[PDB]
Structure 1
Amino acid sequence: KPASMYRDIDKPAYTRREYITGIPGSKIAQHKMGRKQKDADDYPVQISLIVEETVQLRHGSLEASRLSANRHLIKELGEEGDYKMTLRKFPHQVLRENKDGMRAAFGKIVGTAARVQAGEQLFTAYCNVEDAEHVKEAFRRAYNKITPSCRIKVERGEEL
């Protein structure tokens, strides 16, 4: 289905699994990536990806982006390069669809999304001053698969 159906925030927060059922499983396979044993302070550079508009990101978008995003870093830095990217958000908001007529319209659970207020960090990478351009390119790809426009901001990087 189109993201148009669930990109804005207009329903009440809907996440009480204790009342909701048939909630589809997350398509996300890893929130921690790269060398997840090292640390964030172990790196000079810390570039995160910031969402410019508050929205909802269906897990299919997170994974779709996170994938092609990280997949780049794996390519340009090796399946064991010296980096560690992270996706801090999680798909809590449950999404329904009324699939009859308008009678008894409450839908049936079909997905999960992550509410991300504008200005927040969807992703946060940690790399060495060299691969800083491979991470920026790794985000240029990722922000093409989520709905909002974004900013690639450096949290620690005087090397420029």
Structure 2
Amino acid sequence: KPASMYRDIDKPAYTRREYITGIPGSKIAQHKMGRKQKDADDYPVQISLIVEETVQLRHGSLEASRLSANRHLIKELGEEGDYKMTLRKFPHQVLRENKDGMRAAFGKIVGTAARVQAGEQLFTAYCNVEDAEHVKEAFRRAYNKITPSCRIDSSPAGNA
């Protein structure tokens, strides 16, 4: 199913689990990657992926981008590299599909998405001055799998 069907915020917030059943499980495997036993403060560099437009990102997209991102950081820094990345958003918005003409159209439940306002940080990585260019590349791959354009913003890191 095309994301064109759900990328916009053109519907009420639909998140109440107490009134919704049959919600598919999320495809997001992890929200915290890298060395999650260490603190983000222990790193000199902090780079985030910022969404430039307000949108809805289906869990299937979060998983693809996050995966193709962390996958790179693993291939470039190792299955235990000294870095840590976080996907701070969770897909709370339940999505429908009307799958019988327009009669009794309320759709059946088919998925979940996370609402992201323009300017927000979707992902955030913390690395050493060395692996700074590797994380920037992981994000370049990630923003290629989500609807909006993004900014790869570098927070603590005046080692230009």
The two structures have a TM-score, normalised by structure 1, of 1.00
Deviation at residue 34 of structure 1 after TM alignment: 0.4
Deviations 1:56-94 (CA, angstroms, capped at 9, x unpaired):
000000000000010000000000000000000000000
Partner residue, 1:127: 127
Gaps (5+ residues) in structure 1? none
CA distance in 1, matches of 2:102, 2:21: 22
SS in structure 1 of the partner of residue 37 of structure 2 = coil
CA distance in 2, matches of 1:142, 1:69: 5
Gaps (5+ residues) in structure 2? none
Partner residue, 1:106: 106
CA distance in 1, matches of 2:137, 2:147: 18
Deviations 1:14-64 (CA, angstroms, capped at 9, x unpaired):
000000010000000100000000001000000000000000000000000
Deviations 1:126-151 (CA, angstroms, capped at 9, x unpaired):
00000000000000000000000000
- The structure whose residues are more often strand, as a share, is 2
Deviations 1:72-121 (CA, angstroms, capped at 9, x unpaired):
00000000000000000000000000001100000000000000000000
SS in structure 1 of the partner of residue 126 of structure 2 = coil
CA distance in 2, matches of 1:17, 1:81: 38
Within 5 Å, give how 1:71-82 maps onto structure 2: 71-82=71-82
CA distance in 2, matches of 1:154, 1:37: 23
CA distance in 2, matches of 1:34, 1:40: 11
Partner residue, 1:70: 70
